[PDB]
Structures are given as structure tokens and as C-alpha cells.
């Protein structure tokens, strides 16, 4: 045990040599904590900037990984929103919120919004967090917004601590696990377009209304419509969670990882090449061969 917490996990362990640790196999995987999250950005009013202004998340503390998907897949949620720079909140917005007193909170500005988000995800310490389009758009906009806001303890997104922001395929959330439903569905099923809407109508057989950002500027001035958008984001989280639970992408990933000897982080990020890469690495080493070095250029862009 080292003197200082090197991560945000509860327990720490230190080892002098790799051979000090070994393998035990005859245990069934524990259930863990799954989390859904939803956030709305909006191309800023003045000139071409993203404004992450909405928060929404679904949590199920004890989530099975070898049994049936829990129904319902959550027991609690929370939402926080803010005015980015000029989108004035409607009259008695929080008053109507507390009148309906459904699980939602307000935040004044973006820095407070993301600070609340980060401390909440810290205290939840999820092991499977899931959102739509986290490969290319939402995770990158998340890191850029925590940059511009200079979010305190920014590295708390992962379970480790790093003072300097990286630049960066996976260096962001070291400790926690991101789940993008669309890529997993792209691996399993055939769909016209892997957008969330079409995925829901093809699999869940339910419609979701697409809300253009070009209309919502006046929409921030009306409490009922803004709360409609907020509950739309809640139903978005619900639909994503329903898709992933029903399609049981998590136990699929577990079995694939146990077959291939890979890292489940890379597995869920995507690429059959990496999983069967680790499989063949295991095979050539157990047959006592020499594996060629990882190719230096790397840098895939898709």
C-alpha cells in the first residue's frame, strides 16, 4: 500500500514484480454498476461552438452480466441544465420543476453543470457507462468542453488521476468503460442507417422525434417545451438502455473477451482485428513463438 491515492478507486495495491500475481479461474463474474448518460449540445448562437447544456443519466447499481437484463434497467436518474450564454430560462422554470418534482435539477452555467456531472460520475464510479455516438462526437465534445470550462479534477471521468490533459485514442477515461450502442449494433444487425432514430424504429419498433437545434433558441423561453425536451432526453436514455439491455451487448463482449484474451476496453471501442490480435498473441506465446512488434505508425482514423 502506497501512502497516497494514485487513483479514485477505493482500494490500491502495489506489486514489485509481475510474477507475484497469478490467475484463479473457478469464480463467476460479479455483477457490476452500469450507467446510461445523455447530453445535448447546441451550435452556439454567435459563431460555431458546441454548447453542452443538458445532462441526463440512468443508473442501475447491481447490473447482471451473465443473467437476464434487469427489468427495469434502472432505479434512479437525474438531470441538470443551464443557460449557455443568453438562452434565458423561462419564468418560474425551477418552480414548475419542483411542482412536478420529478428527478431533475438546474444549474446556472456550464462550469457548474460539468462540475456537477463530474462529481456525480465520480460518486457513481460506473463500470459500464453507455451513450450514443461516443466514438467521434460526444466524447470529443465532452473533453473540449471540460477544457474550455477547465473542469476541476478533470481526470475524474476515469478512475485514475492525471493532471495534464492528453492528446488520445483512449487516454481520456482510464478507469471507466465507455459503451457505444451504434457500433455494437453495426457488428450484429443490418440497418438502413445506424442513427439512434432508425435503430430504435428497426429494433425497438418505436419512433423518437428529432428536435432540430435551429428551433430550440426560442424554446429555451418556454418552461413546458423545455421540460418536454428534457423528458425527451430522458426517453432517449431509456431507449438506449433498452436497446443495449435487450441486445445484451455486455455478456456478448464478456464472452468475446474471454475467448480472445484481449482488453474489453478495446473490444467495446471496436475492431475485430484487435480482439483476434490478442487471441493470436496468446496462441503464439503458449506455443512459444515470437510475435512481431506492434506496427509503429498505428493511427487509424475510422
Amino acid at each position: 500500500l502506497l501512502n497516497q491515492p494514485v487513483s479514485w478507486c477505493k482500494v490500491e495495491a502495489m506489486a514489485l514484480k509481475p510474477d507475484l500475481v497469478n490467475v484463479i479461474k473457478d469464480v463467476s463474474p460479479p455483477p457490476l454498476v452500469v450507467m446510461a448518460f445523455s447530453m445535448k449540445t447546441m451550435q452556439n448562437a454567435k459563431n460555431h461552438q458546441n454548447e453542452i447544456i443538458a445532462m441526463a443519466a440512468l443508473v442501475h447499481h447491481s447490473f447482471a452480466l451473465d443473467k437476464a437484463a434487469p427489468k427495469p434497467p434502472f432505479q434512479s436518474h437525474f438531470c441538470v441544465v443551464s443557460k449557455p450564454k443568453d438562452c434565458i430560462f423561462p419564468y418560474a422554470f425551477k418552480e414548475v420543476i419542483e411542482k412536478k418534482n420529478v428527478k431533475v435539477e438546474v444549474a446556472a452555467t456550464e462550469r457548474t453543470l460539468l462540475g456537477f456531472f463530474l462529481a456525480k460520475v465520480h460518486k457513481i464510479d460506473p463500470d459500464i457507462i453507455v451513450g450514443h455516438n461516443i466514438y467521434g462526437f460526444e466524447l470529443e465534445v465532452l473533453l473540449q468542453r471540460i477544457n474550455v470550462c477547465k473542469a476541476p479534477h478533470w481526470s475524474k471521468i476515469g478512475r485514475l488521476k492525471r493532471s495534464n490533459m492528453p492528446k488520445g485514442e483512449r487516454n481520456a477515461t482510464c478507469g471507466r468503460m465507455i459503451c457505444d450502442v451504434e457500433i455494437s449494433a453495426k457488428e450484429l444487425i443490418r440497418c438502413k442507417s445506424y442513427h439512434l432514430s432508425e435503430l430504435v424504429q428497426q429494433i425497438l419498433k418505436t419512433e423518437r422525434v428529432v428536435i432540430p437545434m435551429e428551433n430550440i433558441q426560442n424554446m429555451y423561453s418556454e418552461s413546458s417545451q423545455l421540460l418536454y425536451l428534457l423528458e425527451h432526453t430522458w426517453k432517449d436514455a431509456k431507449f438506449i438502455l433498452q436497446i443495449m439491455c435487450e441486445l445484451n451487448v455486455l455478456p456478448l463482449a464478456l464472452q468475446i473477451t474471454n475467448i480472445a484474451g484481449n482488453i474489453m476496453s478495446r473490444t467495446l471501442m471496436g475492431g475485430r482485428s484487435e480482439r483476434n490480435e490478442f487471441l493470436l498473441l496468446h496462441a503464439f506465446y503458449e506455443n512459444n513463438y515470437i510475435v512481431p512488434d506492434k506496427q509503429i505508425f498505428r493511427k487509424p482514423q475510422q
Partner: protein, 105 residues
């Protein structure tokens, strides 16, 4: 004038401990929270400062008429007969009570 009751919060329960990073933005960003009615206070005791983030925002008895002062070094602002607490954003966590003050315009 304007009479607002700012609730008292708890030090290890707050999730947003800092309004920002520089002196000029905290004095403006915090005052935005005053007009939005989303700002709380943490009463000052021993050992409470190391759990909050610089820059700090403090409420000063100007004469409950109060004023806003922000400290960087922490030499002769917190320790006095004029300090009441440290102003922090409200994040919906349950407060303990409410303290009523008056803002001078």
C-alpha cells in the same frame, strides 16, 4: 432593495467548489448566480478552507446588507468579525437551513 435567503450547505457534500479560475470572472460569474437564485453558502470554521477550490468568493458585512469580496492569499479576509461564509453554487443537494442577507445595488 433585494432580500435573498441563501441556504447553508455542507463542505463534503458540494459538487461545484469553484466558480472558475480567475479574479475577474468569479466576481461576475458568482453575481450571475445571485440573480438566478442558485447560490448557497458554507459557514466558515476551522479546517473548511482546504476542501474548497481557489478562487474563493466571500460575503462581507458592509454595514442584512452585505457585499462581495474575493480573496486570493487568505491573509486578512476570512479571519475577522465581518466574515459569514463562502458562497458556492447550488446543485440541488439538501441544505441545512437558510441565511437571509441583502444585496446592495
Amino acid at each position: 432593495h433585494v432580500q435573498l435567503s441563501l441556504p447553508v450547505l455542507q463542505v463534503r457534500d458540494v459538487l461545484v467548489r469553484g466558480f472558475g479560475d480567475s479574479v475577474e470572472e468569479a466576481l461576475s460569474e458568482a453575481r450571475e448566480h445571485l440573480k438566478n437564485g442558485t447560490c448557497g453558502l458554507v459557514e466558515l470554521e476551522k479546517g473548511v478552507l482546504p476542501q474548497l477550490e481557489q478562487p474563493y468568493v466571500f460575503i462581507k458585512r458592509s454595514d442584512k446588507v452585505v457585499e462581495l469580496v474575493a480573496e486570493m492569499d487568505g491573509i486578512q479576509y476570512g479571519r475577522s468579525g465581518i466574515t459569514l461564509g463562502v458562497l458556492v453554487p447550488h446543485v440541488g443537494e439538501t441544505p441545512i437551513a437558510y441565511r437571509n442577507v441583502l444585496l446592495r445595488k
